[PDB]
Structure 1
Amino acid sequence: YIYSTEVGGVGGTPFTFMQESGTITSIKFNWSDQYKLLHHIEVKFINNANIYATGDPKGNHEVILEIDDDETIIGSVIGYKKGNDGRCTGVKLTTSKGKSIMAGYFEESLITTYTGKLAGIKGGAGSDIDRLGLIFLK
């Protein structure tokens, strides 16, 4: 496993979504024009009908990316407000098959992450996504 920097604030309840010998097949991002933040994320893993969720699903928008079993992330950008009082603002992902999604806003700070097979996510959430970091295979 490769751990990409968790970006955003130090707030919210911790979460770690990863599963032995499995990878992410679906990820959903929920955000608002009201606060220009991510509020909620859900993830499903290959061979597991369970939905792992975090944060309050209170936003007016929601995008889903479904990921073929041989499909990698070749480009990834997370927008955030920096600081202890920080927050995760947006996500742009682009895959090895030219699929892409764009969620929320990118007006303050950006990270272009590591690339590879997306395997999990970790960070903190409450009303909002406080911090978010991606996890890849090695």
Structure 2
Amino acid sequence: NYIYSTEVGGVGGTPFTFMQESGTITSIKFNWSDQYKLLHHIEVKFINNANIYATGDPKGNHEVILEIDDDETIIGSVIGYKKGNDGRCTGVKLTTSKGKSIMAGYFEESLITTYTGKLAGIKGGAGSDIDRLGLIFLK
């Protein structure tokens, strides 16, 4: 019942997989730096669940939060990254079925335009930086 968007970036970091069965993401936060031009930290909240699921080191000078209504889908989703085994996530642009949008970080090397739908989860690897990030949707 889930669609796994391609994980983009490098092979480094501590693995993460955040997905509650019968739930969807109600809030997502991205943390990035002007110093490295990288995403560093991600936080996620699910419906009817106050717990925050986090990865990465929140050392960046900027963060954006997107709140998602229960009937709201992602209709546009771009992740910017540096490719190769030594790849990092650099940016994210999300647009919703209600015209809400967020833009984090930088888009200077490689891009992926992912699958659309109801955002259910995230998987990847993170340490000091977001090495790699894949979105997960409902089928």
Deviation at 1:20, TM superposition (A): 1.0
Deviation at 1:11, TM superposition (A): 0.2
**1:72-100 superposed Cα distances (whole Å, 9 cap, x missing partner):** 00000000000100000000000000000
In the alignment, which residue of structure 1 is the partner of 2:37? 36
Deviation at 1:33, TM superposition (A): 0.3
In the alignment, which residue of structure 2 is the partner of 1:51? 52
**1:78-127 superposed Cα distances (whole Å, 9 cap, x missing partner):** 00000100000000000000000000000000000000000000000000
Matches within 5 A, 1:74-93: 74-93=75-94
Q: What is the TM-score with the length of structure 2 in the denominator?
A: 0.99
**Counterparts of 1:13 and 1:55 in 2: how far apart (Å)?**
9
In the alignment, which residue of structure 2 is the partner of 1:136? 137
| Poorly superposed stretches of 4+, deviation over 2 Å | none
**1:29-49 superposed Cα distances (whole Å, 9 cap, x missing partner):** 000000000000000000111
Deviation at 1:6, TM superposition (A): 0.1
Deviation at 1:23, TM superposition (A): 0.2
Matches within 5 A, 1:5-16: 5-16=6-17
> Percentage identity across aligned positions?
100
**Counterparts of 1:6 and 1:49 in 2: how far apart (Å)?**
26
Deviation at 1:19, TM superposition (A): 0.3
**Counterparts of 1:94 and 1:20 in 2: how far apart (Å)?**
24
Residue 11 of structure 2 aligns to a residue in which SS? coil
**Counterparts of 1:100 and 1:20 in 2: how far apart (Å)?**
26
Deviation at 1:57, TM superposition (A): 0.1
Aligned length: 138
Question: Which runs of no fewer than 5 residues in structure 1 stay unpaired?
Answer: none
Computed over aligned residues only, the root mean square deviation of the Cα atoms, in angstroms, reads 0.2
**Counterparts of 1:54 and 1:112 in 2: how far apart (Å)?**
23
Q: What is the TM-score with the length of structure 1 in the denominator?
A: 1.00
**1:48-75 superposed Cα distances (whole Å, 9 cap, x missing partner):** 1100000000000000000000000000
